[PDB]
Amino acid sequence: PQIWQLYLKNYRIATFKNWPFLEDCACTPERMAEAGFIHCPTENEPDLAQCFFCFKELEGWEPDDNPIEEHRKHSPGCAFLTVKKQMEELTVSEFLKLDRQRAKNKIAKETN
Ligand SMILES: [Zn+2]
Ligand SMILES: [Zn+2]
Numbered sequence: 001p002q003i004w005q006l007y008l009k010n011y012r013i014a015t016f017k018n019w020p021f022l023e024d025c026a027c028t029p030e031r032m033a034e035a036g037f038i039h040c041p042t043e044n045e046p047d048l049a050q051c052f053f054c055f056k057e058l059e060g061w062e063p064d065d066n067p068i069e070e071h072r073k074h075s076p077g078c079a080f081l082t083v084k085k086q087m088e089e090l091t092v093s094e095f096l097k098l099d100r101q102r103a104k105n106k107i108a109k110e111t112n
Helices: 009-014 029-035 067-073 092-110
Strands: 037-039 049-051
Touching: 009 029, 029 037, 029 067
Parallel strands: none
Antiparallel strands: 037 049
16 A cells, blocks of 8 residues: 555546546546546645646646546656556566656756
């Protein structure tokens, strides 16, 4: 279990609460979390989502938005996006590979 349940959809899905766009539209909380986003709104940033992997923030969503393409567009180099396979299907080999990058990204985020 530990501190990285965000590798798991269900946990990312949980992050969504008050997320407008409720069901049947390309931007359901399930499609979003599927793309790697978590929900972290604020006074001024109601619909602010962030990739648990890239840490890159993005705003301005609309019911008919495919979360993956916007993610793909504004963060072309997200390793999470390369794996055309759900985390559950990644070997522990690939998961440990992948998680080396994630942590490296985290630091590059405080690097600002
Ligand atoms: Zn990302
Ligand atoms: Zn955009």
